[PDB]
PDB file of C-alpha atoms in Angstrom:
ATOM      1  CA  UNK Y   4     -18.337  28.186  13.852  1.00  0.00           C
ATOM      2  CA  UNK Y   5     -18.223  27.059  10.084  1.00  0.00           C
ATOM      3  CA  UNK Y   6     -15.520  24.255  10.547  1.00  0.00           C
ATOM      4  CA  UNK Y   7     -17.616  22.751  13.338  1.00  0.00           C
ATOM      5  CA  UNK Y   8     -20.900  23.191  11.730  1.00  0.00           C
ATOM      6  CA  UNK Y   9     -19.707  21.594   8.809  1.00  0.00           C
ATOM      7  CA  UNK Y  10     -18.418  18.347  10.427  1.00  0.00           C
ATOM      8  CA  UNK Y  11     -21.800  18.170  12.381  1.00  0.00           C
ATOM      9  CA  UNK Y  12     -23.847  19.146   9.926  1.00  0.00           C
ATOM     10  CA  UNK Y  13     -22.484  16.203   7.646  1.00  0.00           C
ATOM     11  CA  UNK Y  14     -21.427  13.617  10.462  1.00  0.00           C
ATOM     12  CA  UNK Y  15     -25.495  13.640  10.945  1.00  0.00           C
ATOM     13  CA  UNK Y  16     -26.332  12.796   7.189  1.00  0.00           C
ATOM     14  CA  UNK Y  17     -24.033   9.678   6.799  1.00  0.00           C
ATOM     15  CA  UNK Y  18     -20.225   8.229   6.583  1.00  0.00           C
ATOM     16  CA  UNK Y  19     -19.863   8.463   2.709  1.00  0.00           C
ATOM     17  CA  UNK Y  20     -21.661  11.963   2.331  1.00  0.00           C
ATOM     18  CA  UNK Y  21     -19.278  12.909   5.644  1.00  0.00           C
ATOM     19  CA  UNK Y  22     -16.394  11.374   3.737  1.00  0.00           C
ATOM     20  CA  UNK Y  23     -16.798  13.607   0.432  1.00  0.00           C
ATOM     21  CA  UNK Y  24     -17.674  16.329   2.002  1.00  0.00           C
ATOM     22  CA  UNK Y  25     -14.362  16.284   4.079  1.00  0.00           C
ATOM     23  CA  UNK Y  26     -12.424  15.719   0.491  1.00  0.00           C
ATOM     24  CA  UNK Y  27     -13.619  19.150  -0.557  1.00  0.00           C
ATOM     25  CA  UNK Y  28     -13.738  21.337   2.587  1.00  0.00           C
ATOM     26  CA  UNK Y  29     -10.277  20.485   4.365  1.00  0.00           C
ATOM     27  CA  UNK Y  30      -8.845  18.227   1.577  1.00  0.00           C
ATOM     28  CA  UNK Y  31      -5.755  16.651   3.982  1.00  0.00           C
ATOM     29  CA  UNK Y  32      -8.319  15.159   6.388  1.00  0.00           C
ATOM     30  CA  UNK Y  33      -9.231  13.037   3.593  1.00  0.00           C
ATOM     31  CA  UNK Y  34      -5.934  11.187   3.907  1.00  0.00           C
ATOM     32  CA  UNK Y  35      -7.094   9.238   6.817  1.00  0.00           C
ATOM     33  CA  UNK Y  36     -10.529   9.020   5.943  1.00  0.00           C
ATOM     34  CA  UNK Y  37     -12.023  10.139   9.298  1.00  0.00           C
ATOM     35  CA  UNK Y  38     -15.776   9.971  11.018  1.00  0.00           C
ATOM     36  CA  UNK Y  39     -16.994  11.901  13.838  1.00  0.00           C
ATOM     37  CA  UNK Y  40     -18.503   9.769  16.663  1.00  0.00           C
ATOM     38  CA  UNK Y  41     -19.017  12.617  18.561  1.00  0.00           C
ATOM     39  CA  UNK Y  42     -19.284  16.548  19.006  1.00  0.00           C
ATOM     40  CA  UNK Y  43     -20.197  19.179  20.830  1.00  0.00           C
ATOM     41  CA  UNK Y  44     -18.649  21.957  22.694  1.00  0.00           C
ATOM     42  CA  UNK Y  45     -15.710  20.513  24.989  1.00  0.00           C
ATOM     43  CA  UNK Y  46     -16.078  17.286  23.638  1.00  0.00           C
ATOM     44  CA  UNK Y  47     -15.150  15.553  20.214  1.00  0.00           C
ATOM     45  CA  UNK Y  48     -14.240  11.928  19.441  1.00  0.00           C
ATOM     46  CA  UNK Y  49     -13.395  10.641  15.714  1.00  0.00           C
ATOM     47  CA  UNK Y  50     -12.305   7.483  14.158  1.00  0.00           C
ATOM     48  CA  UNK Y  51     -10.582   6.778  11.314  1.00  0.00           C
ATOM     49  CA  UNK Y  52      -9.855   2.772   9.612  1.00  0.00           C
ATOM     50  CA  UNK Y  53      -6.612   0.924   9.442  1.00  0.00           C
ATOM     51  CA  UNK Y  54      -5.717   0.320   5.688  1.00  0.00           C
ATOM     52  CA  UNK Y  55      -2.849   0.684   3.107  1.00  0.00           C
ATOM     53  CA  UNK Y  56      -2.802   4.356   2.930  1.00  0.00           C
ATOM     54  CA  UNK Y  57      -2.158   5.141   6.478  1.00  0.00           C
ATOM     55  CA  UNK Y  58       0.651   2.471   6.964  1.00  0.00           C
ATOM     56  CA  UNK Y  59       4.382   3.356   8.088  1.00  0.00           C
ATOM     57  CA  UNK Y  60       7.387   0.617   7.222  1.00  0.00           C
ATOM     58  CA  UNK Y  61       6.226  -1.726   9.822  1.00  0.00           C
ATOM     59  CA  UNK Y  62       2.858  -1.888   8.703  1.00  0.00           C
ATOM     60  CA  UNK Y  63       0.919  -0.215  11.459  1.00  0.00           C
ATOM     61  CA  UNK Y  64      -0.614   3.139  11.492  1.00  0.00           C
ATOM     62  CA  UNK Y  65       1.389   6.035  11.090  1.00  0.00           C
ATOM     63  CA  UNK Y  66       2.399   8.127  13.634  1.00  0.00           C
ATOM     64  CA  UNK Y  67       1.598  11.076  11.554  1.00  0.00           C
ATOM     65  CA  UNK Y  68      -2.120   9.596  10.629  1.00  0.00           C
ATOM     66  CA  UNK Y  69      -2.387  10.053  14.160  1.00  0.00           C
ATOM     67  CA  UNK Y  70      -1.528  12.988  14.441  1.00  0.00           C
ATOM     68  CA  UNK Y  71      -3.480  14.019  11.871  1.00  0.00           C
ATOM     69  CA  UNK Y  72      -6.749  12.537  13.478  1.00  0.00           C
ATOM     70  CA  UNK Y  73      -5.708  14.428  16.674  1.00  0.00           C
ATOM     71  CA  UNK Y  74      -5.484  17.518  14.991  1.00  0.00           C
ATOM     72  CA  UNK Y  75      -9.310  17.200  13.740  1.00  0.00           C
ATOM     73  CA  UNK Y  76     -10.620  16.504  16.930  1.00  0.00           C
ATOM     74  CA  UNK Y  77      -8.802  18.944  18.976  1.00  0.00           C
ATOM     75  CA  UNK Y  78      -9.471  21.861  16.218  1.00  0.00           C
ATOM     76  CA  UNK Y  79     -13.211  21.058  15.395  1.00  0.00           C
ATOM     77  CA  UNK Y  80     -13.707  21.485  19.447  1.00  0.00           C
ATOM     78  CA  UNK Y  81     -12.122  24.416  19.517  1.00  0.00           C
ATOM     79  CA  UNK Y  82     -13.696  25.751  16.907  1.00  0.00           C
ATOM     80  CA  UNK Y  83     -17.408  24.749  18.573  1.00  0.00           C
ATOM     81  CA  UNK Y  84     -16.168  25.477  22.032  1.00  0.00           C
ATOM     82  CA  UNK Y  85     -15.024  29.208  21.999  1.00  0.00           C
ATOM     83  CA  UNK Y  86     -17.554  32.037  21.999  1.00  0.00           C
ATOM     84  CA  UNK Y  87     -18.081  33.047  18.422  1.00  0.00           C
ATOM     85  CA  UNK Y  88     -16.263  36.746  18.833  1.00  0.00           C
ATOM     86  CA  UNK Y  89     -13.129  34.606  19.441  1.00  0.00           C
ATOM     87  CA  UNK Y  90     -10.967  33.006  16.913  1.00  0.00           C
ATOM     88  CA  UNK Y  91      -8.324  30.541  16.992  1.00  0.00           C
ATOM     89  CA  UNK Y  92      -5.379  29.239  15.597  1.00  0.00           C
ATOM     90  CA  UNK Y  93      -3.108  25.963  16.617  1.00  0.00           C
ATOM     91  CA  UNK Y  94       0.665  27.181  17.232  1.00  0.00           C
ATOM     92  CA  UNK Y  95       2.175  24.361  18.744  1.00  0.00           C
ATOM     93  CA  UNK Y  96       1.589  20.264  19.129  1.00  0.00           C
ATOM     94  CA  UNK Y  97       3.489  17.801  21.533  1.00  0.00           C
ATOM     95  CA  UNK Y  98       2.958  14.173  21.036  1.00  0.00           C
ATOM     96  CA  UNK Y  99       4.204  10.958  22.315  1.00  0.00           C
ATOM     97  CA  UNK Y 100       4.471   7.762  20.675  1.00  0.00           C
ATOM     98  CA  UNK Y 101       3.133   5.159  23.846  1.00  0.00           C
ATOM     99  CA  UNK Y 102       2.539   1.831  21.431  1.00  0.00           C
ATOM    100  CA  UNK Y 103       1.960   0.834  17.898  1.00  0.00           C
ATOM    101  CA  UNK Y 104      -1.179   1.202  16.490  1.00  0.00           C
ATOM    102  CA  UNK Y 105      -2.557  -2.227  14.865  1.00  0.00           C
ATOM    103  CA  UNK Y 106      -6.064  -1.762  13.975  1.00  0.00           C
ATOM    104  CA  UNK Y 107      -8.855   1.162  13.870  1.00  0.00           C
ATOM    105  CA  UNK Y 108      -7.764   4.624  15.667  1.00  0.00           C
ATOM    106  CA  UNK Y 109     -10.512   6.115  17.843  1.00  0.00           C
ATOM    107  CA  UNK Y 110      -9.314   9.599  19.345  1.00  0.00           C
ATOM    108  CA  UNK Y 111     -10.765  11.287  22.032  1.00  0.00           C
ATOM    109  CA  UNK Y 112     -10.558  15.300  23.050  1.00  0.00           C
ATOM    110  CA  UNK Y 113     -11.719  15.663  26.293  1.00  0.00           C
ATOM    111  CA  UNK Y 114     -12.171  19.541  26.678  1.00  0.00           C
ATOM    112  CA  UNK Y 115     -14.284  19.451  30.104  1.00  0.00           C
ATOM    113  CA  UNK Y 116     -11.516  21.102  31.717  1.00  0.00           C
ATOM    114  CA  UNK Y 117     -10.373  24.036  29.579  1.00  0.00           C
ATOM    115  CA  UNK Y 118     -12.113  27.663  30.245  1.00  0.00           C
ATOM    116  CA  UNK Y 119     -13.224  28.047  26.723  1.00  0.00           C
ATOM    117  CA  UNK Y 120     -14.377  31.218  26.989  1.00  0.00           C
ATOM    118  CA  UNK Y 121     -10.661  32.748  27.925  1.00  0.00           C
ATOM    119  CA  UNK Y 122      -8.626  34.123  25.517  1.00  0.00           C
ATOM    120  CA  UNK Y 123      -4.645  33.293  25.171  1.00  0.00           C
ATOM    121  CA  UNK Y 124      -3.048  29.740  25.069  1.00  0.00           C
ATOM    122  CA  UNK Y 125      -5.689  26.962  25.698  1.00  0.00           C
ATOM    123  CA  UNK Y 126      -3.626  23.700  25.492  1.00  0.00           C
ATOM    124  CA  UNK Y 127      -6.396  21.267  24.289  1.00  0.00           C
ATOM    125  CA  UNK Y 128      -5.631  16.829  24.950  1.00  0.00           C
ATOM    126  CA  UNK Y 129      -6.309  14.594  22.656  1.00  0.00           C
ATOM    127  CA  UNK Y 130      -5.465  10.721  23.472  1.00  0.00           C
ATOM    128  CA  UNK Y 131      -5.635   7.639  20.691  1.00  0.00           C
ATOM    129  CA  UNK Y 132      -6.856   4.131  20.768  1.00  0.00           C
ATOM    130  CA  UNK Y 133      -6.721   0.977  19.080  1.00  0.00           C
ATOM    131  CA  UNK Y 134      -9.027  -1.547  20.692  1.00  0.00           C
ATOM    132  CA  UNK Y 135      -9.650   0.942  23.704  1.00  0.00           C
ATOM    133  CA  UNK Y 136      -5.939   0.721  24.527  1.00  0.00           C
ATOM    134  CA  UNK Y 137      -4.114   3.896  24.673  1.00  0.00           C
ATOM    135  CA  UNK Y 138      -1.465   3.936  21.600  1.00  0.00           C
ATOM    136  CA  UNK Y 139      -0.862   8.111  21.437  1.00  0.00           C
ATOM    137  CA  UNK Y 140      -0.905  11.459  23.105  1.00  0.00           C
ATOM    138  CA  UNK Y 141      -1.355  14.719  22.062  1.00  0.00           C
ATOM    139  CA  UNK Y 142      -1.418  18.068  23.262  1.00  0.00           C
ATOM    140  CA  UNK Y 143      -2.368  21.106  20.700  1.00  0.00           C
ATOM    141  CA  UNK Y 144      -1.885  24.530  21.914  1.00  0.00           C
ATOM    142  CA  UNK Y 145      -4.643  27.036  20.267  1.00  0.00           C
ATOM    143  CA  UNK Y 146      -3.885  30.615  20.203  1.00  0.00           C
ATOM    144  CA  UNK Y 147      -7.271  32.396  21.137  1.00  0.00           C
ATOM    145  CA  UNK Y 148      -7.952  35.882  20.450  1.00  0.00           C
ATOM    146  CA  UNK Y 149     -11.158  38.600  20.667  1.00  0.00           C
ATOM    147  CA  UNK Y 150     -10.914  39.179  16.837  1.00  0.00           C
TER     148      UNK Y 150
ATOM    149  CA  UNK J  16      27.975   2.755   3.981  1.00  0.00           C
ATOM    150  CA  UNK J  17      24.445   2.887   5.095  1.00  0.00           C
ATOM    151  CA  UNK J  18      21.898   0.493   3.999  1.00  0.00           C
ATOM    152  CA  UNK J  19      19.614   3.498   3.311  1.00  0.00           C
ATOM    153  CA  UNK J  20      22.245   5.682   1.665  1.00  0.00           C
ATOM    154  CA  UNK J  21      23.484   2.461  -0.307  1.00  0.00           C
ATOM    155  CA  UNK J  22      19.271   2.491  -1.512  1.00  0.00           C
ATOM    156  CA  UNK J  23      19.207   6.489  -2.241  1.00  0.00           C
ATOM    157  CA  UNK J  24      22.895   6.395  -4.414  1.00  0.00           C
ATOM    158  CA  UNK J  25      21.556   3.572  -6.658  1.00  0.00           C
ATOM    159  CA  UNK J  26      18.274   4.767  -7.431  1.00  0.00           C
ATOM    160  CA  UNK J  27      18.877   8.519  -7.131  1.00  0.00           C
ATOM    161  CA  UNK J  28      16.294  10.779  -5.283  1.00  0.00           C
ATOM    162  CA  UNK J  29      13.385  11.172  -7.684  1.00  0.00           C
ATOM    163  CA  UNK J  30      13.163   7.053  -7.280  1.00  0.00           C
ATOM    164  CA  UNK J  31      13.917   6.975  -3.967  1.00  0.00           C
ATOM    165  CA  UNK J  32      10.809   9.166  -3.419  1.00  0.00           C
ATOM    166  CA  UNK J  33       8.581   6.764  -4.849  1.00  0.00           C
ATOM    167  CA  UNK J  34       9.924   4.087  -2.982  1.00  0.00           C
ATOM    168  CA  UNK J  35       9.665   5.572   0.252  1.00  0.00           C
ATOM    169  CA  UNK J  36       6.023   6.444  -0.608  1.00  0.00           C
ATOM    170  CA  UNK J  37       5.750   2.573  -0.865  1.00  0.00           C
ATOM    171  CA  UNK J  38       7.425   1.273   2.063  1.00  0.00           C
ATOM    172  CA  UNK J  39       5.531   3.824   4.395  1.00  0.00           C
ATOM    173  CA  UNK J  40       2.445   4.577   2.381  1.00  0.00           C
ATOM    174  CA  UNK J  41       1.094   7.210   4.308  1.00  0.00           C
ATOM    175  CA  UNK J  42       3.892   9.493   3.513  1.00  0.00           C
ATOM    176  CA  UNK J  43       2.712   9.167   0.054  1.00  0.00           C
ATOM    177  CA  UNK J  44       0.055  11.433   0.651  1.00  0.00           C
ATOM    178  CA  UNK J  45       2.057  14.307   0.413  1.00  0.00           C
ATOM    179  CA  UNK J  46       3.989  13.308  -2.874  1.00  0.00           C
ATOM    180  CA  UNK J  47       7.465  13.812  -1.401  1.00  0.00           C
ATOM    181  CA  UNK J  48      10.611  14.945  -3.556  1.00  0.00           C
ATOM    182  CA  UNK J  49      14.207  14.483  -1.773  1.00  0.00           C
ATOM    183  CA  UNK J  50      16.226  17.043  -3.046  1.00  0.00           C
ATOM    184  CA  UNK J  51      19.199  15.486  -0.785  1.00  0.00           C
ATOM    185  CA  UNK J  52      20.215  12.874   1.526  1.00  0.00           C
ATOM    186  CA  UNK J  53      23.489  12.311   3.073  1.00  0.00           C
ATOM    187  CA  UNK J  54      24.823  11.627   6.754  1.00  0.00           C
ATOM    188  CA  UNK J  55      23.423  14.367   8.984  1.00  0.00           C
ATOM    189  CA  UNK J  56      21.129  15.783   6.160  1.00  0.00           C
ATOM    190  CA  UNK J  57      17.575  15.519   4.689  1.00  0.00           C
ATOM    191  CA  UNK J  58      15.863  17.857   2.312  1.00  0.00           C
ATOM    192  CA  UNK J  59      12.554  17.216   0.868  1.00  0.00           C
ATOM    193  CA  UNK J  60      10.153  19.599  -0.871  1.00  0.00           C
ATOM    194  CA  UNK J  61       6.481  18.354  -1.428  1.00  0.00           C
ATOM    195  CA  UNK J  62       4.015  20.608  -3.755  1.00  0.00           C
ATOM    196  CA  UNK J  63       0.850  22.491  -2.706  1.00  0.00           C
ATOM    197  CA  UNK J  64      -1.970  21.136  -4.488  1.00  0.00           C
ATOM    198  CA  UNK J  65      -5.564  20.870  -3.782  1.00  0.00           C
ATOM    199  CA  UNK J  66      -4.483  17.303  -1.794  1.00  0.00           C
ATOM    200  CA  UNK J  67      -2.837  18.624   1.212  1.00  0.00           C
ATOM    201  CA  UNK J  68      -4.756  21.604   1.506  1.00  0.00           C
ATOM    202  CA  UNK J  69      -6.725  22.573   5.140  1.00  0.00           C
ATOM    203  CA  UNK J  70     -10.320  24.118   5.458  1.00  0.00           C
ATOM    204  CA  UNK J  71      -8.483  28.048   4.772  1.00  0.00           C
ATOM    205  CA  UNK J  72      -6.998  26.903   1.742  1.00  0.00           C
ATOM    206  CA  UNK J  73      -2.891  26.849   3.056  1.00  0.00           C
ATOM    207  CA  UNK J  74      -1.047  23.693   3.159  1.00  0.00           C
ATOM    208  CA  UNK J  75      -2.337  21.543   6.175  1.00  0.00           C
ATOM    209  CA  UNK J  76      -0.463  21.560   9.274  1.00  0.00           C
ATOM    210  CA  UNK J  77      -0.233  18.092   9.587  1.00  0.00           C
ATOM    211  CA  UNK J  78       1.320  17.674   6.133  1.00  0.00           C
ATOM    212  CA  UNK J  79       3.879  19.770   7.131  1.00  0.00           C
ATOM    213  CA  UNK J  80       4.529  17.472  10.027  1.00  0.00           C
ATOM    214  CA  UNK J  81       4.471  14.383   7.627  1.00  0.00           C
ATOM    215  CA  UNK J  82       7.271  16.021   5.458  1.00  0.00           C
ATOM    216  CA  UNK J  83       9.032  16.644   8.936  1.00  0.00           C
ATOM    217  CA  UNK J  84       9.025  13.088   9.912  1.00  0.00           C
ATOM    218  CA  UNK J  85       9.767  12.086   6.604  1.00  0.00           C
ATOM    219  CA  UNK J  86      13.139  14.134   6.490  1.00  0.00           C
ATOM    220  CA  UNK J  87      13.990  13.397  10.164  1.00  0.00           C
ATOM    221  CA  UNK J  88      13.199   9.570   9.982  1.00  0.00           C
ATOM    222  CA  UNK J  89      15.509   8.798   6.774  1.00  0.00           C
ATOM    223  CA  UNK J  90      18.347  11.626   7.665  1.00  0.00           C
ATOM    224  CA  UNK J  91      18.503   9.356  11.071  1.00  0.00           C
ATOM    225  CA  UNK J  92      18.024   5.797   9.437  1.00  0.00           C
ATOM    226  CA  UNK J  93      21.033   6.979   6.968  1.00  0.00           C
ATOM    227  CA  UNK J  94      23.410   8.123   9.404  1.00  0.00           C
ATOM    228  CA  UNK J  95      23.735   6.062  12.434  1.00  0.00           C
ATOM    229  CA  UNK J  96      26.206   2.772  12.042  1.00  0.00           C
ATOM    230  CA  UNK J  97      24.601  -0.142  10.844  1.00  0.00           C
ATOM    231  CA  UNK J  98      24.602  -1.960  14.380  1.00  0.00           C
ATOM    232  CA  UNK J  99      22.078   0.908  15.510  1.00  0.00           C
ATOM    233  CA  UNK J 100      18.593   1.309  15.796  1.00  0.00           C
ATOM    234  CA  UNK J 101      15.857   3.798  16.267  1.00  0.00           C
ATOM    235  CA  UNK J 102      12.822   4.610  16.921  1.00  0.00           C
ATOM    236  CA  UNK J 103      10.732   7.869  17.602  1.00  0.00           C
ATOM    237  CA  UNK J 104      10.078   8.989  20.923  1.00  0.00           C
ATOM    238  CA  UNK J 105       7.528  11.984  20.382  1.00  0.00           C
ATOM    239  CA  UNK J 106       7.533  15.258  18.450  1.00  0.00           C
ATOM    240  CA  UNK J 107       7.273  18.938  19.125  1.00  0.00           C
ATOM    241  CA  UNK J 108       6.305  21.570  16.624  1.00  0.00           C
ATOM    242  CA  UNK J 109       5.545  25.079  16.471  1.00  0.00           C
ATOM    243  CA  UNK J 110       3.528  26.606  13.656  1.00  0.00           C
ATOM    244  CA  UNK J 111       4.842  29.892  12.492  1.00  0.00           C
ATOM    245  CA  UNK J 112       3.041  30.910   9.450  1.00  0.00           C
ATOM    246  CA  UNK J 113       0.880  30.089   7.050  1.00  0.00           C
ATOM    247  CA  UNK J 114       1.977  27.778   4.125  1.00  0.00           C
ATOM    248  CA  UNK J 115       0.877  29.125   1.195  1.00  0.00           C
ATOM    249  CA  UNK J 116       3.200  27.641  -1.702  1.00  0.00           C
ATOM    250  CA  UNK J 117       5.577  24.824  -2.091  1.00  0.00           C
ATOM    251  CA  UNK J 118       7.029  23.246   0.882  1.00  0.00           C
ATOM    252  CA  UNK J 119      10.873  22.524   1.812  1.00  0.00           C
ATOM    253  CA  UNK J 120      11.643  20.691   4.780  1.00  0.00           C
ATOM    254  CA  UNK J 121      15.400  20.480   5.973  1.00  0.00           C
ATOM    255  CA  UNK J 122      16.024  18.163   8.878  1.00  0.00           C
ATOM    256  CA  UNK J 123      19.532  19.433   9.804  1.00  0.00           C
ATOM    257  CA  UNK J 124      21.908  17.002  11.545  1.00  0.00           C
ATOM    258  CA  UNK J 125      24.695  18.893  11.733  1.00  0.00           C
ATOM    259  CA  UNK J 126      25.266  19.334  15.175  1.00  0.00           C
ATOM    260  CA  UNK J 127      24.148  15.823  16.254  1.00  0.00           C
ATOM    261  CA  UNK J 128      26.559  13.003  17.048  1.00  0.00           C
ATOM    262  CA  UNK J 129      25.074  10.544  14.777  1.00  0.00           C
ATOM    263  CA  UNK J 130      27.440   7.587  16.414  1.00  0.00           C
ATOM    264  CA  UNK J 131      25.958   8.740  20.040  1.00  0.00           C
ATOM    265  CA  UNK J 132      23.152   6.555  21.477  1.00  0.00           C
ATOM    266  CA  UNK J 133      20.372   7.371  23.790  1.00  0.00           C
ATOM    267  CA  UNK J 134      18.057  10.197  23.084  1.00  0.00           C
ATOM    268  CA  UNK J 135      18.131  12.145  19.989  1.00  0.00           C
ATOM    269  CA  UNK J 136      16.341  15.230  19.214  1.00  0.00           C
ATOM    270  CA  UNK J 137      16.512  16.021  15.325  1.00  0.00           C
ATOM    271  CA  UNK J 138      15.792  19.815  14.374  1.00  0.00           C
ATOM    272  CA  UNK J 139      13.183  20.141  11.394  1.00  0.00           C
ATOM    273  CA  UNK J 140      12.361  23.261   9.619  1.00  0.00           C
ATOM    274  CA  UNK J 141      10.145  23.894   6.497  1.00  0.00           C
ATOM    275  CA  UNK J 142       9.968  26.718   4.569  1.00  0.00           C
ATOM    276  CA  UNK J 143       7.444  28.512   1.540  1.00  0.00           C
ATOM    277  CA  UNK J 144       9.563  30.911  -0.492  1.00  0.00           C
ATOM    278  CA  UNK J 145      12.620  30.310   1.764  1.00  0.00           C
ATOM    279  CA  UNK J 146      10.830  31.388   4.823  1.00  0.00           C
ATOM    280  CA  UNK J 147      10.134  29.634   7.622  1.00  0.00           C
ATOM    281  CA  UNK J 148       6.692  28.386   8.735  1.00  0.00           C
ATOM    282  CA  UNK J 149       7.144  25.596  10.959  1.00  0.00           C
ATOM    283  CA  UNK J 150       9.772  23.667  13.311  1.00  0.00           C
ATOM    284  CA  UNK J 151       9.702  20.637  14.655  1.00  0.00           C
ATOM    285  CA  UNK J 152      12.024  18.562  17.041  1.00  0.00           C
ATOM    286  CA  UNK J 153      11.635  14.622  16.766  1.00  0.00           C
ATOM    287  CA  UNK J 154      13.106  12.751  19.402  1.00  0.00           C
ATOM    288  CA  UNK J 155      14.774   9.380  18.148  1.00  0.00           C
ATOM    289  CA  UNK J 156      15.921   6.719  20.787  1.00  0.00           C
ATOM    290  CA  UNK J 157      19.133   5.058  18.970  1.00  0.00           C
ATOM    291  CA  UNK J 158      20.437   1.663  20.946  1.00  0.00           C
ATOM    292  CA  UNK J 159      22.652  -0.718  19.821  1.00  0.00           C
ATOM    293  CA  UNK J 160      20.983  -3.618  17.883  1.00  0.00           C
TER     294      UNK J 160
END
């Protein structure tokens, strides 16, 4: 839908343009300065850089900045994957903090196992990595309805 | 008595708000303002403004989560004994309604034994116009230093 179409359109043009677009059209995501590596029905992958602005009190990437990346990947993938006649709304999220995140983050939302044509609750998984090692996991429950 | 309480007592809520945003920068992304912090209770508000909006113009779900983390974390640090330490293990949240105005996040430690060790589940509710729009439970593992 619109959200994923925007993300895709601008990921294809360039990073600085994608950054300006997200700052204007889904503002809070700009707080982590993310970029999409890949986005298509059933799969989303985003990255964001480690920088002062996204740190916690022990100087590692903030737990909530990781949640923000997860929300961006899961939500955009959901928008790109359900039928155009359906709508989605996040209703819950559970996350676990596996390790300190000490560098640039890559978050992967694998939607290959979800029945995207189904209405009701769909649970989208996300794993975030630093230097290819898992540091965070989330499951975001999207309520999908024909609407 | 607590180190964080000593700090809060000395500078007052407005200044403490600027300090926490300095200490853990990502919290500054929501421009939080403490209303109250004491053993067993933390209350923080943050304004609805351009910077914290989502693609539908309401307050972004993760900005709410950030306020919850801030309230639960500071309440925990302020409430456990000096010789104890804490660290969040994870969190579960529910999105109840769209947040369409300034937010008030309340970490309720009224029924938690702050002297206990092991897992403590801290509940947070965030409100807009006094109505609940979001809830979270953040699990902290507390141990002896």
